From TrEMBL, chains A, B, C:
Gene expressing this chain: env
Subunit structure: The mature envelope protein (Env) consists of a homotrimer of non-covalently associated gp120-gp41 heterodimers. The resulting complex protrudes from the virus surface as a spike.
Localization annotation: Host cell membrane; Host endosome membrane; Virion membrane
Source organism, top-level taxon: Viruses
Domain notes: The 17 amino acids long immunosuppressive region is present in many retroviral envelope proteins. Synthetic peptides derived from this relatively conserved sequence inhibit immune function in vitro and in vivo.
Residue runs in coiled coils: 86-113
Retroviral envelope protein GP41-like domain sequence ranges: 1-123
Section covered of the full-length record: 552 to 674 of 879
Protein name (database record): Envelope glycoprotein gp160
């Protein structure tokens, strides 16, 4: 009269949930690439903005033999506040990523063990 | 002496976990919109940067009847590397999204079946 | 002959899954900060682009005592479409975030209760 069948359905449900959790992790990795990729493009834009500062007043004088170039900074480059803050952000993700892999590894061993034990009941 | 009550709590716990997993999926969809929305804004910025290249030296000559316009590229437009790489990124998300929906659909049918069977034990 | 041990493994498996779900939430929060941080940088870029519009034709005249400044808009600032749409995006995240916390709180109470009941069976 033991409800082994009900347990089989319950154990199977946990397996499906674990698979979906893993799918979210891969999807999360894809999202991270999009954000990081945008930053690389943003850095390229910063270099072009500096070039615009170089353009100020050229050939604006035909009674003198000189050209005035004023490349005043345009894109404010982040030296310490963004890098130090961004590194902390990346480091937090690395610790959470390692923790999720350890938890998933333990779940896989326990999941198989629970199903293995179930088979012994009705092998 | 069967622990049907314990099973009821266990089955209910799986239902709550499934709901939270679905909530993460919707939240993930909202995050994707933010990243994609930023790219559309970035493209608008690229068009303005090209306009800046057009500004070089105008009216810088009152002893000639001509104007010099030098629209040298400014924003580096991505023709194949980003589009091909971004399409692969979007395609990977589409396959994972379809897989999560299939897994969730199966879980919903199994979850209801497990609860339905539980009701038969004590209906 | 009750499978209390199998239930202990099953109950433990749910606990591990709940922990991983919580880890995804924190990771999701870190991802949100990266996207929002980029927008703040984008606004800074918009201010510099306006400055470029100011640079048009200076000193381009040595037979006149005047300077022509033409600061034509460059970065298209979003007044209502992005803010209204972005506020809706942020609001949707706030409702989903509150819903996930409520579901997790209920799961923690049910999880402890299921384990507490298990202890009574074999305390």
């Amino acid at each position: 009269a033991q409800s082994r069948t009900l347990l089989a359905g319950i154990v199977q449900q946990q397996q499906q949930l674990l698979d979906v959790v893993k799918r979210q992790q891969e999807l999360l990795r894809l999202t991270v690439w999009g954000t990081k990729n945008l930053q690389t493009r943003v850095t390229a834009i910063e270099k072009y903005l500096k070039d615009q500062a170089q353009l100020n007043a050229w050939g604006a004088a035909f009674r003198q033999v000189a050209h005035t170039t004023v490349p005043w900074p345009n894109a404010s480059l982040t030296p310490k506040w963004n890098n130090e803050t961004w590194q902390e952000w990346e480091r937090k993700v690395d610790f959470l990523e390692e923790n999720i892999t350890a938890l998933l590894e333990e779940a896989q061993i326990q999941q198989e063990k629970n199903m293995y034990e179930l088979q012994k009941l009705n092998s």
